[PDB]
Structure 1
């Protein structure tokens, strides 16, 4: 998109290539640099991400999940009861998780 062949050929395919770039970024974005299966998984909503929970359990990866009163535990290694819809509540969990993980190997 910067150094390779983008302006070559017509514009239609260039529009197609850029359009597909946007699609791939949206679907698999901040995962591109992971380069291997994780060793922990944090979820915001257990019921809404049951597919992700099942995959982690299949691969034997620890799972931390925020579960609401309508969610299903026993697919979660570390259950965290609480609201998972309110933006304020979600921001609180993410900030705390972001802070605690920042202290890495030190």
Structure 2
């Protein structure tokens, strides 16, 4: 059932903008495009899940990251749909590496979250209302998903690792295990658990985010139907 799925419209990407380290992961170059070998993506999607599973069922949280408009939303879903921390906006630096401090911004979201519903607003000149509002607005804008666990993610799942490599660095400098969906655009070596496949067309993104967040909850109970994806999906 997987083969026909991926191969359907979810394989082979980046062309000639490649990176030689991604060789063991290729069939050939069709019409110019690099066509990754799918037969190995299984053996790799496998081992990857082998790692997800043996974590979902040991109650440890996973940070999802994606900041590209071709794959932002389709993660905000699978994250809420797993109740897991995620990053949809600009993955600000040092979020992990400098946790204690970025966190201090979260404790500013709830500093306003509770001074939202309150009688203290009867006052505060129109100045601080526009201000404190805006401040909660953006605070929120960037930290919608970076609240969740106030603890260092036991691992991290990421779309284009070369995109949010900054992130990958942080995790890597902290020994935090790293899973991610990289293509030819991305250098394998520096990813602990590797998902070799498309990283742009919203097709392959949902197919691997889905069955990943699906295999997440299948170690907690609650097997459901697929998640919101089609709404204008081509």
What TM-score results when the alignment is normalised by the length of structure 2?
Answer: 0.43
Higher RCO (CA 8 Å, separation ≥ 6 residues): 2
Matched, 1:103 2:218: yes
Equivalent in 135, 155, 161 of residue 40 of structure 1: 155
Structure 2 Cα separation of the partners of residues 10 and 81 of structure 1: 55
Partner of 2:16: none
**Deviations along 1:45-83, whole A, 9 cap, x unmatched?**
111010110111111111111111111222210111100
Q: For residue 2 of structure 1, what is the aligned residue in structure 2? A: 117
Shift of the alpha carbon at 1:91?
1.1
Go from structure 1 to structure 2 and tell me whether the alpha carbon gap of 1:3 and 1:83 turns closer, same or farther (over 3 Å shift): same
Cα displacement (A) at 1:103:
2.2
Asked if the contact 1:64–1:78 (Cα under 8 Å) also holds between the matched residues in 2, the reply is yes
Q: Residues 1-106 of structure 1: matches in 2 within 5 Å?
A: 1-3=116-118, 5-105=120-220
SS at match of 1:5: helix
**Rounded Cα–Cα distance in structure 1 between residues aligned with 2:122 and 2:211:** 45
- The aligned residue for residue 50 of structure 2 is none
Change beyond 3 A, Cα 1:4–1:28:
farther
TM-score between both structures, scaled by the size of structure 1: 0.90
Q: Structure 1 residues 4, 30: CA separation in 2 closer, same or farther (over 3 Å shift)?
A: farther
* CA distance in structure 1 between the partners assigned to 2:129 and 2:160 by the alignment: 38
Root-mean-square deviation (CA, aligned residues, Å) is 1.5
Unaligned residue ranges in structure 1 (runs of 5+): none
Q: CA 1:14 to 1:62, structure 2 compared with 1: closer, same or farther past 3 Å?
A: same
Q: How many residues align?
A: 106
Q: Is the Cα contact below 8 Å between 1:54 and 1:75 reproduced in 2?
A: no
